[PDB]
Design an enzyme around this catalytic site. Structure first.
Site, PDB file in Angstrom:
ATOM      1  N   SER A  46       9.881   8.687   0.465  1.00 42.77           N
ATOM      2  CA  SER A  46       9.318   7.549   1.220  1.00 42.77           C
ATOM      3  C   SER A  46       9.861   6.196   0.742  1.00 42.77           C
ATOM      4  CB  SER A  46       7.786   7.596   1.235  1.00 42.77           C
ATOM      5  OG  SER A  46       7.192   7.408  -0.036  1.00 42.77           O
ATOM      6  N   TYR A  83       6.911  11.098  -2.786  1.00 41.90           N
ATOM      7  CA  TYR A  83       6.862   9.671  -3.092  1.00 41.90           C
ATOM      8  C   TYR A  83       8.276   9.048  -3.046  1.00 41.90           C
ATOM      9  CZ  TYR A  83       5.947   5.509  -6.064  1.00 41.90           C
ATOM     10  OH  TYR A  83       5.838   4.256  -6.616  1.00 41.90           O
ATOM     11  N   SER A  84       9.236   9.636  -3.765  1.00 42.13           N
ATOM     12  CA  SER A  84      10.611   9.162  -3.800  1.00 42.13           C
ATOM     13  C   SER A  84      11.275   9.137  -2.441  1.00 42.13           C
ATOM     14  CB  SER A  84      11.436   9.982  -4.782  1.00 42.13           C
ATOM     15  OG  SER A  84      10.790   9.896  -6.039  1.00 42.13           O
ATOM     16  N   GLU A  92      -4.473   0.606 -13.209  1.00 43.74           N
ATOM     17  CA  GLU A  92      -5.415   1.697 -13.488  1.00 43.74           C
ATOM     18  C   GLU A  92      -4.964   3.042 -12.907  1.00 43.74           C
ATOM     19  OE1 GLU A  92      -9.479   0.052 -12.672  1.00 43.74           O
ATOM     20  OE2 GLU A  92      -8.885  -1.203 -14.384  1.00 43.74           O
ATOM     21  N   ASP A  97       1.335  -1.275 -15.585  1.00 44.40           N
ATOM     22  CA  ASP A  97       0.040  -0.985 -16.221  1.00 44.40           C
ATOM     23  C   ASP A  97      -1.197  -1.049 -15.269  1.00 44.40           C
ATOM     24  OD1 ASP A  97      -0.515  -3.802 -16.014  1.00 44.40           O
ATOM     25  OD2 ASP A  97      -0.620  -4.182 -18.168  1.00 44.40           O
ATOM     26  N   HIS A 152       0.786  -1.229   0.000  1.00 41.92           N
ATOM     27  CA  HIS A 152       0.000   0.000   0.000  1.00 41.92           C
ATOM     28  C   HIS A 152       0.842   1.316   0.000  1.00 41.92           C
ATOM     29  CE1 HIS A 152       0.877  -0.477   4.266  1.00 41.92           C
ATOM     30  NE2 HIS A 152       0.841   0.855   4.302  1.00 41.92           N
ATOM     31  N   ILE A 153       0.286   2.359  -0.623  1.00 40.56           N
ATOM     32  CA  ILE A 153       0.786   3.729  -0.607  1.00 40.56           C
ATOM     33  C   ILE A 153      -0.394   4.659  -0.450  1.00 40.56           C
ATOM     34  CG2 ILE A 153       2.997   3.327  -1.852  1.00 40.56           C
ATOM     35  CD1 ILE A 153       1.540   4.994  -4.291  1.00 40.56           C
TER      36      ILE A 153
HETATM   37  N1  LIG Z   1       1.820   1.171 -10.870  1.00 40.55           N
HETATM   38  C1  LIG Z   1       3.110   1.544 -10.989  1.00 40.55           C
HETATM   39  O1  LIG Z   1       3.475   2.087 -12.017  1.00 40.55           O
HETATM   40  C2  LIG Z   1       4.110   1.341  -9.895  1.00 40.55           C
HETATM   41  C3  LIG Z   1       5.480   1.562 -10.144  1.00 40.55           C
HETATM   42  C4  LIG Z   1       6.442   1.378  -9.152  1.00 40.55           C
HETATM   43  C5  LIG Z   1       6.005   0.997  -7.907  1.00 40.55           C
HETATM   44  N2  LIG Z   1       4.703   0.804  -7.658  1.00 40.55           N
HETATM   45  C6  LIG Z   1       4.350   0.411  -6.291  1.00 40.55           C
HETATM   46  O2  LIG Z   1       3.523  -0.770  -6.300  1.00 40.55           O
HETATM   47  C7  LIG Z   1       2.609  -0.682  -5.181  1.00 40.55           C
HETATM   48  C8  LIG Z   1       1.160  -0.886  -5.611  1.00 40.55           C
HETATM   49  O3  LIG Z   1       0.877   0.085  -6.615  1.00 40.55           O
HETATM   50  P1  LIG Z   1      -0.445   0.067  -7.527  1.00 40.55           P
HETATM   51  O4  LIG Z   1      -0.129   0.888  -8.805  1.00 40.55           O
HETATM   52  O5  LIG Z   1      -0.842  -1.382  -7.817  1.00 40.55           O
HETATM   53  O6  LIG Z   1      -1.564   0.812  -6.644  1.00 40.55           O
HETATM   54  P2  LIG Z   1      -3.165   0.920  -6.646  1.00 40.55           P
HETATM   55  O7  LIG Z   1      -3.727   0.074  -7.782  1.00 40.55           O
HETATM   56  O8  LIG Z   1      -3.553   2.397  -6.686  1.00 40.55           O
HETATM   57  O9  LIG Z   1      -3.592   0.329  -5.237  1.00 40.55           O
HETATM   58  C9  LIG Z   1      -3.208   0.974  -4.040  1.00 40.55           C
HETATM   59  C10 LIG Z   1      -3.779   0.134  -2.915  1.00 40.55           C
HETATM   60  O10 LIG Z   1      -3.505   0.767  -1.656  1.00 40.55           O
HETATM   61  C11 LIG Z   1      -4.770   0.974  -0.985  1.00 40.55           C
HETATM   62  N3  LIG Z   1      -4.687   2.196  -0.174  1.00 40.55           N
HETATM   63  C12 LIG Z   1      -4.715   3.496  -0.606  1.00 40.55           C
HETATM   64  N4  LIG Z   1      -4.624   4.310   0.394  1.00 40.55           N
HETATM   65  C13 LIG Z   1      -4.585   3.586   1.548  1.00 40.55           C
HETATM   66  C14 LIG Z   1      -4.517   3.886   2.926  1.00 40.55           C
HETATM   67  N5  LIG Z   1      -4.516   5.192   3.363  1.00 40.55           N
HETATM   68  N6  LIG Z   1      -4.563   2.882   3.821  1.00 40.55           N
HETATM   69  C15 LIG Z   1      -4.537   1.619   3.425  1.00 40.55           C
HETATM   70  N7  LIG Z   1      -4.566   1.280   2.146  1.00 40.55           N
HETATM   71  C16 LIG Z   1      -4.598   2.217   1.187  1.00 40.55           C
HETATM   72  C17 LIG Z   1      -5.825   1.018  -2.123  1.00 40.55           C
HETATM   73  O11 LIG Z   1      -7.173   0.735  -1.741  1.00 40.55           O
HETATM   74  P3  LIG Z   1      -8.084   1.782  -0.942  1.00 40.55           P
HETATM   75  O12 LIG Z   1      -8.023   3.168  -1.707  1.00 40.55           O
HETATM   76  O13 LIG Z   1      -9.540   1.240  -0.916  1.00 40.55           O
HETATM   77  O14 LIG Z   1      -7.569   1.985   0.505  1.00 40.55           O
HETATM   78  C18 LIG Z   1      -5.299  -0.095  -3.022  1.00 40.55           C
HETATM   79  O15 LIG Z   1      -5.633  -1.377  -2.476  1.00 40.55           O
HETATM   80  C19 LIG Z   1       2.885   0.676  -4.463  1.00 40.55           C
HETATM   81  O16 LIG Z   1       3.744   0.450  -3.336  1.00 40.55           O
HETATM   82  C20 LIG Z   1       3.580   1.522  -5.552  1.00 40.55           C
HETATM   83  O17 LIG Z   1       4.448   2.542  -5.014  1.00 40.55           O
HETATM   84  C21 LIG Z   1       3.754   0.964  -8.586  1.00 40.55           C
HETATM   85  C1  LIG Z   2      10.469   3.761 -14.370  1.00 37.78           C
HETATM   86  C2  LIG Z   2      10.784   4.908 -13.453  1.00 37.78           C
HETATM   87  C3  LIG Z   2       9.610   5.308 -12.664  1.00 37.78           C
HETATM   88  N1  LIG Z   2       9.113   6.519 -12.725  1.00 37.78           N
HETATM   89  C4  LIG Z   2       8.034   6.638 -11.883  1.00 37.78           C
HETATM   90  C5  LIG Z   2       7.338   7.969 -11.825  1.00 37.78           C
HETATM   91  C6  LIG Z   2       8.041   9.117 -12.532  1.00 37.78           C
HETATM   92  C7  LIG Z   2       7.146   9.446 -13.706  1.00 37.78           C
HETATM   93  C8  LIG Z   2       6.011   8.459 -13.666  1.00 37.78           C
HETATM   94  O1  LIG Z   2       6.021   7.895 -12.361  1.00 37.78           O
HETATM   95  C9  LIG Z   2       7.722   5.477 -11.192  1.00 37.78           C
HETATM   96  C10 LIG Z   2       6.694   5.199 -10.224  1.00 37.78           C
HETATM   97  O2  LIG Z   2       6.909   4.579  -9.190  1.00 37.78           O
HETATM   98  N2  LIG Z   2       5.465   5.703 -10.584  1.00 37.78           N
HETATM   99  C11 LIG Z   2       4.262   5.592  -9.808  1.00 37.78           C
HETATM  100  C12 LIG Z   2       3.034   5.432 -10.718  1.00 37.78           C
HETATM  101  C13 LIG Z   2       2.730   6.749 -11.461  1.00 37.78           C
HETATM  102  C14 LIG Z   2       2.469   7.882 -10.457  1.00 37.78           C
HETATM  103  C15 LIG Z   2       3.708   8.068  -9.549  1.00 37.78           C
HETATM  104  C16 LIG Z   2       4.051   6.759  -8.817  1.00 37.78           C
HETATM  105  C17 LIG Z   2       2.830   6.437  -7.932  1.00 37.78           C
HETATM  106  C18 LIG Z   2       1.584   6.227  -8.811  1.00 37.78           C
HETATM  107  O3  LIG Z   2       0.487   5.909  -7.960  1.00 37.78           O
HETATM  108  C19 LIG Z   2       1.260   7.517  -9.578  1.00 37.78           C
HETATM  109  C20 LIG Z   2       1.835   5.083  -9.818  1.00 37.78           C
HETATM  110  S1  LIG Z   2       8.822   4.216 -11.592  1.00 37.78           S
END
Ligand SMILES: NC(=O)c1ccc[n+]([C@@H]2O[C@H](COP(=O)([O-])OP(=O)(O)OC[C@H]3O[C@@H](n4cnc5c(N)ncnc54)[C@H](OP(=O)(O)O)[C@@H]3O)[C@@H](O)[C@H]2O)c1
Ligand SMILES: CCc1nc([C@H]2CCCO2)c(C(=O)N[C@@H]2[C@@H]3C[C@@H]4C[C@H]2C[C@@](O)(C4)C3)s1
Ligand SMILES: NC(=O)c1ccc[n+]([C@@H]2O[C@H](COP(=O)([O-])OP(=O)(O)OC[C@H]3O[C@@H](n4cnc5c(N)ncnc54)[C@H](OP(=O)(O)O)[C@@H]3O)[C@@H](O)[C@H]2O)c1
Ligand SMILES: CCc1nc([C@H]2CCCO2)c(C(=O)N[C@@H]2[C@@H]3C[C@@H]4C[C@H]2C[C@@](O)(C4)C3)s1
Lengths: 258, 258
Positions: free
Chosen positions: B161, B158-159, B196, B194, B95-96
């Site tokens: 954290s 974000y970075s 949402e 990828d 979670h974030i």
């Molecule tokens: N997608 C990317 O491009 C990407 C890239 C690098 C790293 N990540 C990392 O991968 C992880 C998951 O990312 P994701 O893209 O799959 O996210 P996501 O689809 O937006 O899901 C976030 C989850 O956290 C929950 N959440 C939000 N706020 C909360 C809170 N205050 N308390 C408890 N739970 C909470 C959300 O549900 P609720 O809103 O119902 O609480 C949901 O289950 C994160 O750690 C993110 O930094 C993602």
């Molecule tokens: C590949 C290098 C990365 N750049 C980002 C950064 C730099 C540009 C795009 O994102 C990454 C990242 O962790 N993005 C997350 C996505 C997009 C934004 C920011 C962050 C948290 C989100 O919830 C919203 C999912 S990884």
């Protein structure tokens, strides 16, 4: 190409400047003829530093006492210090909360307090300082550690706060570079330094050579005046050769170029 | 080396598991015959995840709803999850707080919230889970980002954290190497995925190739199962080569004495 004249008449804030590296930086800036405003919790110790600063040749020297655990104190501090100097050229962020060499037990408290004092107060100080730093096209100097770039046991809460500084300040440096905000950001990566705090903390636990605090203080000021992105200062020349991360620079530049 | 059979009957916590990567991890574990406990704020969304986990073949599946802004909820959640499963083998911290792409200006509220939810609650959850993970010689899986190893604009809070997670969890991993606690820690360095959230957030701001969330999720569970220190998952081959920091591991190993 550093010249001590680069600091003459400059308006500088130094945090955690009652003792150690912070105090040595205030003395160096005083000798260079800068305007200084020092801060820490001990009003009495700060008064002694300010007096020696004026003795050394500072254009002016003043202190503001208080705790960086208090975010209202931090915000107001920058405004008060800027009003005392009539602007701001360099913000030196150096204070930390008191820490020791110990294994992480159930100490969420030390983690939270290290994060608030070592990281969040630095952000509040930056936000408060940025309008004046923008006017002067100034500098932010962020004092970190080798433990802020690499993993060591017994400093987990401390390491987290120092890694947080790199993440925050290096990301906003990229933003300033692209928005064309000419405020430089210098992250200082320091090895073990011979301050009374470090020498007490490290006794009979760590067997590393500590570097001189005076030289360390001067290398931070040089970095800031030359607007260097990072300063690396350690007693070992071998450690100093391995600290640079060329893959990170390529990984950043790959995103930057495109 | 990895076999899906490694997760059969394992007792796993998945946080932020109502959507995206977290939901995909819960589904993979369920198909593998694990016991899962999922969390996030939305009870209705978690219920749907729990239903499908049972349908996929989970040994058991439960949900606990709540916000990770509440440290009391974080402590109580682990204890309740542990009772539901009769132990704990793997803790997945994913979670974030809700984050969007923006230049940093004066949002200390977002800095503090990102540090509380993305970093502090992970520590709280870890402290609460450690007795159970120590008894089962378990695993901690920390979901991070490429922005948690390298600097990019638009993601400063974000970075910070994500860099804090590396500093903290890598320092505790070194401590477990001295106390010989058989708890592995996997830091997952992910590129853009990828989900949402990410596709909506990058829209019209950033142009980068996102990798698939199903394979991302599996890759995370695999690294956790194999007790790897770091997992790298990015759409690019070049970036996957460059994410490794060998100077850091030399610097760390060269210290691993006394
Ligand atoms: N997608 C990317 O491009 C990407 C890239 C690098 C790293 N990540 C990392 O991968 C992880 C998951 O990312 P994701 O893209 O799959 O996210 P996501 O689809 O937006 O899901 C976030 C989850 O956290 C929950 N959440 C939000 N706020 C909360 C809170 N205050 N308390 C408890 N739970 C909470 C959300 O549900 P609720 O809103 O119902 O609480 C949901 O289950 C994160 O750690 C993110 O930094 C993602
Ligand atoms: C590949 C290098 C990365 N750049 C980002 C950064 C730099 C540009 C795009 O994102 C990454 C990242 O962790 N993005 C997350 C996505 C997009 C934004 C920011 C962050 C948290 C989100 O919830 C919203 C999912 S990884
Ligand atoms: N010495 C080393 O080996 C070493 C190694 C790497 C990095 N560094 C970095 O260098 C910097 C300074 O280190 P140092 O050894 O010189 O430290 P130090 O001598 O112990 O001084 C710390 C300063 O911070 C002040 N301070 C303490 N708590 C505070 C609070 N709550 N609010 C405001 N100010 C507070 C102290 O004064 P008061 O108690 O009166 O408030 C003092 O002025 C730190 O950022 C540290 O991480 C040091
Ligand atoms: C040589 C690499 C480093 N190790 C440590 C760490 C890891 C091993 C010893 O110090 C560093 C560090 O920043 N130490 C600080 C000193 C000593 C301790 C911890 C921290 C904050 C202090 O106030 C107390 C000053 S730099």
């Amino acid at each position: 190409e550093f010249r001590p004249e680069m600091l003459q008449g400059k308006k500088v804030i130094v945090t955690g400047a009652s003792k150690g590296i912070g105090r040595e930086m205030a003395y160096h800036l005083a000798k260079m003829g800068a305007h200084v405003v020092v801060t820490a919790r001990s009003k009495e110790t700060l008064q002694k530093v300010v007096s020696h600063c004026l003795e050394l040749g500072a254009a002016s020297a003043h202190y503001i006492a208080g705790t960086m655990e208090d975010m209202t104190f931090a915000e107001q501090f920058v405004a008060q210090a800027g009003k005392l100097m009539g602007g701001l050229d360099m913000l030196i962020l150096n204070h930390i909360t008191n820490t020791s060499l110990n294994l992480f037990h159930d100490d969420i408290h030390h983690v939270r307090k290290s994060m608030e004092v070592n990281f969040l107060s630095y952000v509040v100080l930056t936000v408060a300082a940025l309008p004046m730093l923008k006017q002067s096209n100034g500098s932010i100097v962020v004092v970190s550690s080798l433990a802020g770039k690499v993993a060591y046991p017994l400093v987990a809460a401390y390491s987290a706060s120092k890694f947080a500084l790199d993440g925050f300040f290096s990301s906003i440096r990229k933003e300033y570079s692209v928005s064309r905000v000419n405020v430089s950001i210098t992250l200082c990566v320091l090895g073990l330094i011979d301050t009374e705090t470090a020498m007490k903390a490290v006794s009979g636990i760590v067997h590393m050579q500590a570097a001189p605090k005076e030289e360390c203080a001067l290398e931070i000021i040089k970095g800031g005046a030359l607007r260097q992105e990072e300063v690396y200062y350690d007693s070992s020349r071998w450690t100093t050769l391995l600290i640079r991360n060329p893959s990170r620079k390529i990984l950043e530049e790959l995103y930057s170029t495109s």
